[PDB]
Design a protein around this ligand. Structure first.
Ligand code: HEM
Lengths: 727, 63, 84, 83, 63, 63, 63
């Protein structure tokens, strides 16, 4: 008589299975066959549990884990209860400091491989051979919110990849936009305080829609470019799988001859680009604040590995000055029209972690963890970052020995004369702890730099100037990049940007700030400032109306790479559809629905007014995954409503609103047979409407129209029609 | 043979394509015309793409 | 003793308050993925009050058994039938 | 100018959500035409304060609904509204 | 020629395949059509793949 | 119907600056000096000869 | 020469290492060939193009 169910339904299948199918589970039990050298190196610190006795941390078996030791069944607890003291103590000290920023984050394991050797341009060992597989750990994140904030907030996303290479750890620590907010790291804390909750009262959580953030923006137009991206649909992604990733700074590649090439790094999503819309995103933070962390986890269990393609923008040394902005200014993007992104290799994220604290929470990414073959530039934001990511570990992860924490451990050799941290794991046997040393024949030894397996050596850049605290004049341009961004966007994308600003700005309490931000917008584009100013109830003045727009960027009038939806590359594999059930589903409808979806890798969740089962018209038993309220349209890409006893749900508030919300958020909707009577609620015509798939029954045609709407991600053409619906 | 009807429809329909090249670059735009050997892709300027250098041509939606 | 206090609580509540309690359990329980857990929680509710367990079990699509339907409610608390 | 907001998705849903969450609602003059969205009768309904204009009576009925916190009697009627 | 008997098989069997490009990318789907120069690969849309840019074809099950 | 010859001729004739992306991704700049079936002469500051089998794409700096 | 050499490996059913143009090293045994492709076996049978092959290396000598 043990407490597990007799039929074994406590324990999930060790098999790729869809979202909702099984309980979720630590990667090593859900996917024991997936391996790589990092994950196998972790074996020495994994701990199982089955068929083991419960014990104190010192090895003692425990007989009663239900009670304190007391003088009598009703007496005081005694101080000699060391079992209770240890158990409580450990609990008492469970928590460690959250990250200063990107505290909220979700990770996975995986690997990378280059498409071709890159030894022409860099000696980076991990890029030397397309047969060389490099294990990676990746953590995606928000920026502002605490470790327990929501996933779908309007924020920048972080995208950090730790490469466990054969010649050291390389950390690629990037974001989901190609620029940053600020130019010099010295104002880092200023900006971060400005967007972080306000100090007197700790409000708002994971939001920029407050007074101080915009106050800052309005006084530092350097921020405006990235603020643009934030306000766009870019700042509210569908999935960590459906965003682009950027290294932001220009770095250097260095080859075996010592030739430097400037580079900026990119991650390009094989899943394509896709993002939510605001109302959907905002309300989803309430309905499932773990939406991204969840979707990532499930996508992986489900076999839908997130894949990204590592690409380089490369710029030769003698081109440093050909662009009319500065390559070292991190608030400027390099348009792909001027420098295209060359795909170099690919990363696959193919297994979840076992313990979220152990592996995610404690991981330490730092951009200055580079390897031979790479080097820095004078980007004055990058310069700063170098300092901070080592420092902060000392209090986050408790000391200098954070590289000994399992997930952070290199997978190549590491030896030196560094001794003695807090929580030191390694026990050095070297008779010497210094060099030069004769007593251990100077081991371990320096290694001269070389083609492969060499010492690190910095590129010998010429430095000429005086010791000054002064912004480069070449950084003094703020508007042409925002403008470029804005004119690259589709019309509906621009409505969103407008509504983005209007919403945020409307929660700035001190109205003079609203005006000052509008004033900034005037310098970027007058359409934009008009639309926003209308929505805030502001009249642009004559002065403002006449403001000259900034120059084209190097003669560019737009760059299609900056739009999410310019050239849809939306991909349905991994997406999810809601199927609204009634007690009497027409089975051959449903057969055809699930069969079609399954063929293109699209997941379904069957929903009803309650849990349990319903039966088909042919007596197939249909298990319910959640109720209408339990799994709102927010959480799905489309809604399908098959035929049957429509009378069952026809007057159900929740089923109707499921459709109304779905419609307002521009999602595809498919109604078979009598389900078409739901058109009434969505105030649709009897003639039909684009984006509403309809028919006597679900067939070849019905499903294909639907899936094709899905390849378009959203039904943009619906926008004009949604303001009348009240959802 | 196949290239021709496929390319021809993309153009005639003015549907956005992506063109992935052997060098790992991805070009995007609308197909303006083609050739025994090349394709013209419209964007800000038109540009000449040598077929021997293209690896895949990917429509943004069904034809 | 585990049940008489829950029972006391429950019978002190207004009818609309009890709908809420019911819907509370039903909502939470519906996001427990492993259904045997849903059943076991329902079983506990049976020992507190049968109205309550029926309403919740309906919403989860569970049939209380004969065994469950007959479960004797716990004692009043010191002769109390409710506390406002 | 009820015409201004009468067909506004957001103003209507403001009322629909408010109604589903059992909150007091008070509509003066032409604002009574919003009863249509909340699928309320023309006869009136307990919890919806209504009148030609806001006066002594109108406000007091409202504040008194507020002293009751919520309109519990509404519960049976809310499952039909889709909010 | 061995190309075509094999490609035809994969087409009529609507078997899922993995096309590996010389540039080292991997493509996926079902073979819709082919000639001396291209392969049409079916998924959501069709995509034109130049055989000169293809290095290896791998089926998701032997045929 | 050749397009590559009119296209390249127009570029040279107008002495308009171009970008030539090679098959390994490298950007070349210049004006077309003259051409072949097989090569292009790219006049930059020095006249250099570029094999066409190594060219991916050719990009005018204006219409 | 190509056919004396391939047939010998096929008939002796010897393990070979096929290096491609990107740098990738494939392995297994040669089941059949063509003017254009090779079929390599190990777990699954896969179809490699000759235009993508750089070198075939025998694991051991043949006549
Ligand atoms: C170039 C723009 C920047 C990018 C793309 C960026 C990226 C990130 C990301 C993605 C994280 C989360 C790391 C994780 O998942 O562990 C992060 C954390 C951090 N960043 Fe930023 N960051 C940027 C600017 C800065 C600046 C200017 C500073 C300080 C000057 C800074 C200092 C930190 C520190 C101290 C942590 C986390 C604590 C730690 O992981 O040790 N970063 N950075």
């Amino acid at each position: 008589d043990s407490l597990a169910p007799e039929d074994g339904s406590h324990r999930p299948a060790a098999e790729p299975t869809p979202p909702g199918a099984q309980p979720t589970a630590p990667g090593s039990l859900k996917a024991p066959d997936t391996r790589n050298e990092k994950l196998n190196s972790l074996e020495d610190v994994r701990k199982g549990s089955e068929n083991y006795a419960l014990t104190t941390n010192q090895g003692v078996r425990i007989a009663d884990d239900q009670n304190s030791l007391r003088a009598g069944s009703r007496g005081p607890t005694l101080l000699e209860d060391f079992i209770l003291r240890e158990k409580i103590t450990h609990f008492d000290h469970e928590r460690i400091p959250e990250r200063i920023v990107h505290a909220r984050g979700s990770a996975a394991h995986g690997y990378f491989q280059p498409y071709k050797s890159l030894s022409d341009i860099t000696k980076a060992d991990f890029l030397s051979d397309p047969n060389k597989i490099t294990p990676v750990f990746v953590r995606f994140s928000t920026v502002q919110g605490g470790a327990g904030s929501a996933d779908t907030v309007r924020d920048i996303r972080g995208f950090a990849t730790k490469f466990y290479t054969e010649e050291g750890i390389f950390d690629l620590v990037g974001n989901n936009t190609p620029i940053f907010f600020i130019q010099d790291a010295h104002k880092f804390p200023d900006f971060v305080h400005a967007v972080k909750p306000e100090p007197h009262w700790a409000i708002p959580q994971g939001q920029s829609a407050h007074d101080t953030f915009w106050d800052y923006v309005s006084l530092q137009p350097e921020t405006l470019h990235n603020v643009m991206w934030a306000m766009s649909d870019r700042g509210i992604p569908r999935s960590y799988r459906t965003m682009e990733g950027f290294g932001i700074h220009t770095f250097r590649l260095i080859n075996a001859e010592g030739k430097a090439t400037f580079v900026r790094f990119h991650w390009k999503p094989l899943a394509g680009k896709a993002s939510l819309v605001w109302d959907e995103a905002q309300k989803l933070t309430g309905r499932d604040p773990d939406f991204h962390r969840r979707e990532l986890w499930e996508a992986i269990e489900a076999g839908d590995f997130p894949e990204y393609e590592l690409g380089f923008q490369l710029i030769p040394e003698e081109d440093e000055f050909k662009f009319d902005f500065d390559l070292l200014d991190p608030t400027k993007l390099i348009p792909e029209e001027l420098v295209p992104v060359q795909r170099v290799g690919k990363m696959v994220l193919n297994r979840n972690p076992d313990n979220f604290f152990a592996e995610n929470e404690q991981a330490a990414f730092h951009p200055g963890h580079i390897v031979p073959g790479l080097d820095f530039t004078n980007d004055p934001l990058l310069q700063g970052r170098l300092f901070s990511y080592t420092d902060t570990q000392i209090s986050r992860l408790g000391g200098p020995n954070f590289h000994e924490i399992p997930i952070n451990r290199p997978t190549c050799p590491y030896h030196n004369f560094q001794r003695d941290g807090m929580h030191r794991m390694g026990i050095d046997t070297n008779p010497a702890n210094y060099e030069p040393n004769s007593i251990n024949d100077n081991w371990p030894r320096e290694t001269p730099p070389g083609p492969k397996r060499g010492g690190f050596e910095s590129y010998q850049e010429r430095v000429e100037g005086n010791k000054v605290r002064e912004r480069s004049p070449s950084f003094g341009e703020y508007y042409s990049h925002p403008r470029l961004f804005w004119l690259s966007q589709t019309p509906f994308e621009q409505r969103h940007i407008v509504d983005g600003f209007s919403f945020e700005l409307s929660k700035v309490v001190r109205p003079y700030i609203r005006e000052r931000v509008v004033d900034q917008l005037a310098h970027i584009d007058l359409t934009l400032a008009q639309a926003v100013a209308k929505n805030l109830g502001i009249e642009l003045t004559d002065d403002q109306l006449n403001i000259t727009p900034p120059p084209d960027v190097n003669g560019l009038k737009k760059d299609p790479s900056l739009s999410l939806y310019a050239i849809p590359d939306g991909d349905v594999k991994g997406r999810v559809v809601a199927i609204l059930l009634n007690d009497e589903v027409r089975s051959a409808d449903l057969l055809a629905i699930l069969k079609a979806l399954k063929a293109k890798g699209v997941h379904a969740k069957l929903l009803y007014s309650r849990m349990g089962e319903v039966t088909a018209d042919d007596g197939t038993v249909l298990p319910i995954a959640a109720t209408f309220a339990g799994a709102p349209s927010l959480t799905v890409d489309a809604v399908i409503v098959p035929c049957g006893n429509i009378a069952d749900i026809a007057d159900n508030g929740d089923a109707n609103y499921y459709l109304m919300e779905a419609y307002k958020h521009l999602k595809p909707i498919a109604l078979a047979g009598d389900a078409r009577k739901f058109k009434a609620t969505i105030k649709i015509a009897d003639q039909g409407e684009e984006g509403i798939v309809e028919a006597d029954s679900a067939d070849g045609s019905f499903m294909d129209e639907l899936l094709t709407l899905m390849a378009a991600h959203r039904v943009w053409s619906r926008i004009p029609k949604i303001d009348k619906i009240p959802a | 043979s196949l290239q021709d009807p496929f390319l021809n429809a993309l153009r005639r329909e003015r549907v956005p394509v992506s063109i992935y090249l052997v060098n790992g670059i991805k070009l995007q735009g609308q197909i303006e015309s083609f050739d025994q050997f090349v394709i013209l892709l419209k964007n800000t300027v038109s540009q000449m793409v040598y077929k021997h250098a293209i690896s895949t041509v990917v429509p943004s939606r069904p034809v």
